[PDB]
């Protein structure tokens, strides 16, 4: 049995955060472990309250898991603040947590720590066009401009970059030192969109843990997301969660 | 789709706490929501560090979930301290969280708050013989003495009591105002015992959420636990987790 770790925030509503990550790991037959960075009171209407955890507590969880279980893959989600990002980077380096999927899920300072401390340790970064623009500063509005963006983020240290929605049906770009690839996915419209990015990065981590090559992990993860979106349940009053059983 | 809520602690190792509860909810086709009470750095060797959450943060999570999702059942696990127990009881009462499965998972003060504030709101309490003795103070060493214990706890307010391991193959007693029942389960021996009680209370909550009567929920939950124990994976260096996929 393969094991995966998620270093992210807690979403009480269960649609994103570690709740979604663990459901995905479980669906994919992967044993899930988790290092919480923060705790939120949250539902389908949004976040009502946030409680950041002490950086040392986040580090301790990673240490406890990393030294007892073999980690075949891991992902990072919401990191709260710069101090936490730094503790996470130190832990990831110290315990050799790889391959690592860093899902931006974006404070000015936190973004800086993320790019400088964590990106260099990533096997893959999964920013959306917006996040990509934020990280790089430059604007993105065309496929060619998106590809340059992907390559630009690659220079920050990650071994691969998945810029989502690089061009709008909706195409994502996977950039590696070898070249750029393009993935196409049905722009399925629905209200149940909460946890889309989270579910994607979790599925990729799960697939990597099972031995799938990166490009194939991303394609299978996207195929899973599409199914998850199509049969999303009618739960919550706002943007409902995905159908992780899909 | 039915929804269930777990109000408990976070176990980074994934074998117990909300991690185990959510895996069980998912296995049973129930949508999981969670209100974290505390966060632990933990593995198969035990707990390395504990971080209690502010009582108001625990309350906020329950409120966020309860007002947005219909709750068909819920359970409580580790509650940290008296202040948290009290906030949980207030929330459970205020938002009408029922049916509620209170799993003791036992400070002198916290135990008092649990018994006085939370037990009266429980549809079922699942203490083990030890916990039962602690709560009542009296000693338990015989079946007849165990049955009296079960009935004794029933007088504290809960609508039903499942005293585990009341008599040692291993028999559990389910006491209600109507009478006492006895469940027998194979005393399966294995190192992977981490999260046994947690997995049981979570399965009961999940079954109640799907409309199963109490007695039947307990029997099916126990049947699930037995399977979970039999094929437990070889993960961790100490007492490994159960096979929740069972």
């Amino acid at each position: 049995m393969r094991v995966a770790l998620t270093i992210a925030g807690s979403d009480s509503g269960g649609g994103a955060g570690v709740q979604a990550d663990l459901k995905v790991f479980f669906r994919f037959g992967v044993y899930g472990t988790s290092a919480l960075t923060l705790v939120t009171a949250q539902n389908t209407l949004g976040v009502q309250r946030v409680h950041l955890l002490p950086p040392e507590v986040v580090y301790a969880q990673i240490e406890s898991v990393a030294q007892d279980f073999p980690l075949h893959a891991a992902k990072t989600g919401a990191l709260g603040d710069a101090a936490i990002v730094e503790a996470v980077a130190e832990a990831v380096r110290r315990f050799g947590v790889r391959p690592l999927v860093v899902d931006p899920v974006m404070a000015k300072e936190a973004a800086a720590a993320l790019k400088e401390r964590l990106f260099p340790l990533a096997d893959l970064v999964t920013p959306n066009r917006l996040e990509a623009e934020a990280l790089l500063g430059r604007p993105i509005r065309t496929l060619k401009e998106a590809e340059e963006a992907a390559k630009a983020l690659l220079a920050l240290g990650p071994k691969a970059v998945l810029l989502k929605g690089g061009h709008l049906e909706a195409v994502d770009l996977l950039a590696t030192r070898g070249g750029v690839l393009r993935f196409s996915a049905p722009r399925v419209h629905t209200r149940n969109t909460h946890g889309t990015g989270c579910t994607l990065s979790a599925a990729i981590a799960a697939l990597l843990a099972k031995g799938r090559p990166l490009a194939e992990a991303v394609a299978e993860a996207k195929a899973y997301l599409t199914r998850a979106l199509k049969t999303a349940p009618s739960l919550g009053h706002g943007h409902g969660p995905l159908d992780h059983w899909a």
Side-chain angles (χ1 to χ4, degrees), chain A:
Chain A
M1 186 180 293
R2 300 304 205 304
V3 183
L5 165 71
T6 173
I7 299 168
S10 178
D11 169 6
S12 59
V18 300
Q19 285 70 17
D21 297 331
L22 297 169
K23 279 191 262 258
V24 170
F25 291 167
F26 189 82
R27 175 71 183 82
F28 279 74
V30 173
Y31 184 81
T33 53
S34 66
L36 281 56
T37 55
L38 56 90
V39 176
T40 71
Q42 175 182 176
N43 53 32
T44 62
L45 292 184
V47 176
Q48 288 74 55
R49 185 173 312 203
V50 181
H51 175 80
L52 303 177
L53 299 174
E56 60 273 16
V57 176
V58 177
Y59 185 96
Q61 293 171 84
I62 298 175
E63 176 168 49
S64 287
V65 169
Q67 301 192 318
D68 192 29
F69 304 84
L71 296 177
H72 307 293
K75 64 160 278 178
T76 60
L79 302 173
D81 68 20
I84 293 171
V85 173
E86 293 166 1
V88 170
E90 173 180 354
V92 166
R93 178 183 298 287
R94 167 66 182 71
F95 302 108
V97 182
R98 300 181 297 277
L100 183 73
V101 179
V102 175
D103 191 356
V105 185
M106 298 175 89
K108 205 69 173 184
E109 309 175 62
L114 175 62
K115 298 154 66 179
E116 305 176 6
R117 305 300 185 67
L118 198 52
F119 270 39
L121 309 174
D123 285 273
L124 178 72
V125 293
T126 60
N128 54 45
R129 188 169 63 67
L130 296 62
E131 288 166 350
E133 287 182 352
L135 296 174
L136 296 174
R138 70 172 67 172
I140 304 175
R141 31 193 167 61
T142 63
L143 198 172
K144 283 294 176 298
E145 187 172 57
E147 297 194 3
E148 299 190 305
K151 290 182 178 180
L153 290 173
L154 191 63
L156 290 173
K159 300 177 183 180
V161 176
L162 176 64
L163 198 170
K164 299 177 296 179
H167 187 58
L168 57 173
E169 312 191 64
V171 305
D172 305 323
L173 303 178
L174 176 62
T176 68
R177 65 90 62 179
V180 183
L181 320 196
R182 296 177 51 184
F183 296 82
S184 183
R187 183 73 293 186
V188 55
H189 55 64
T190 174
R191 55 138 51 180
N192 293 61
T193 59
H194 176 53
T196 287
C198 177
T199 294
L200 181 69
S201 58
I204 294 176
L207 290 164
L208 289 180
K210 306 181 74 169
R212 302 278 200 294
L214 181 62
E216 182 68 13
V218 177
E220 285 178 48
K222 287 179 63 59
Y224 167 64
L225 182 63
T226 298
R227 295 197 293 285
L229 282 163
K230 293 188 175 181
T231 50
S234 62
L235 288 171
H237 300 267
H239 291 298
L242 303 174
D243 174 12
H244 295 109
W245 285 277

